[PDB]
Amino acid sequence: ADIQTERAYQKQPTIFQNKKRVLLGETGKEKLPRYYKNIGLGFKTPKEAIEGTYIDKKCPFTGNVSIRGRILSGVVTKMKMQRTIVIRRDYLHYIRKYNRFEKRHKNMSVHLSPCFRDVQIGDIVTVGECRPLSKTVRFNVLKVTKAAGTK
């Protein structure tokens, strides 16, 4: 998978990839070291992020983002943007005059890392709050759980 598709050169800023190498240690390529971080709160780092090659500065595991504040869950409704998806959060709002609830929802645009592959319309995503990534995106997908009847 070629990772150079923009006008600029895509690269993890922390990793230095031009270290001098003698010809005796030139067994193909050096297998460019991968930068990854362990986000806390008991979330495992996907093996894809560790062993991947994608460049994503908004990735919670390989990019420059900090998970802080609220951790929420939603259902994936649309995946038509690049590296970001639209999830749906449903809830019941109480009305005190009638002592009864009404069904409400709100969509949320959340950044989805390339480390989560095979995400389908319908699965559950645990997202975590971060700094503003775009005009409307303030959350990053931290965990993906499949639907109840997946193959």
Binding site: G40, L41, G42, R68, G69, I71
Partner: protein, 262 residues
């Protein structure tokens, strides 16, 4: 509102000052200082409302401008100086020393201390950071930074500071079984032994504390102040020994005192 605010409405002042409603529109508005505005006792309130040494604000100013009041061993001529928890107020002309200790009902009590005990104080540690060629630094709840602290001293611990020099003399580690006072919230002013601390990563930690009478109560970690090692406090406690009476037993005690009076 452009720029900082300089006034404080009397009804908007913190309730533990015990300010009335009809004396004026405004309140003393504590100056910026080592203690937060909501958690301090301005010098004027203590010197006029509490001790009744002065009748008006001008008399408080006249008292302070003769350099009679010392807060933690230093002369303070600012009448709105924020004096807060564990501060030592010394008046040598009349020869008394007070320590600002929360009462059981969450108010700064007039607590007189001996001059031997007025030479030190206890400070909670807020953070530890290394700077400037690998020199460690401690920051206390009193906004004083101390370089070269003991490597064992960690956050949420308590250090005994010699007021004359400003150096650490000993410390208490934050651990279960150590005596503590609650410095904020519903249980403010209560004294008890730490029983258990539950950690919630990314959120606030809750500390459970058991009184000397067997009562238990929870607080947030930021509301806990280690007072003594084990059951013995390192300072003198106010007349109420940190235990909270319910309104029923308070009424019974008041009635017994009334009956025994005369």
């Amino acid at each position: 509102a452009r720029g900082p605010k300089k006034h404080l409405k009397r009804v908007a002042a913190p309730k533990h000052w015990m300010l009335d409603k009809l004396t004026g529109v405004f309140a003393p508005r504590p100056s910026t200082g080592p203690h937060k505005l909501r958690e301090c006792l301005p010098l004027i309130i203590f010197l006029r409302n509490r001790l009744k040494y002065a009748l008006t604000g001008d008399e408080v100013k006249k008292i302070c401008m003769q350099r009679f009041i010392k807060i933690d061993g230093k002369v303070r001529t600012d009448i709105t100086y924020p004096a807060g928890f564990m501060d030592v107020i010394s008046i040598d002309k009349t020869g008394e020393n007070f320590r600002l200790i929360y009462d059981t009902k969450g108010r700064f009590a007039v607590h007189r201390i001996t001059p031997e005990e007025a030479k030190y104080k206890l400070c909670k540690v807020r953070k530890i950071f290394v700077g400037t060629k690998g020199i460690p630094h401690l920051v206390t709840h009193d906004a004083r930074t101390i370089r070269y602290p003991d490597p064992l001293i960690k956050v949420n611990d308590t250090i005994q500071i010699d007021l004359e020099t400003g150096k650490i003399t000993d410390f208490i580690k934050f651990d279960t079984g150590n005596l503590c006072m609650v410095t904020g919230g519903a249980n403010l002013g209560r004294i008890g032994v730490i029983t258990n601390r539950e950690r919630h990563p990314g959120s606030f930690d809750v500390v459970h504390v058991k009184d000397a009478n067997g009562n238990s109560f929870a607080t947030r970690l930021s509301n806990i102040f280690v007072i003594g090692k084990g059951n013995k406090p390192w300072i003198s406690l106010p007349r109420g020994k940190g235990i909270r009476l319910t309104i029923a037993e308070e009424r019974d005690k008041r009635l017994a005192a009334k009956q025994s009076s005369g």
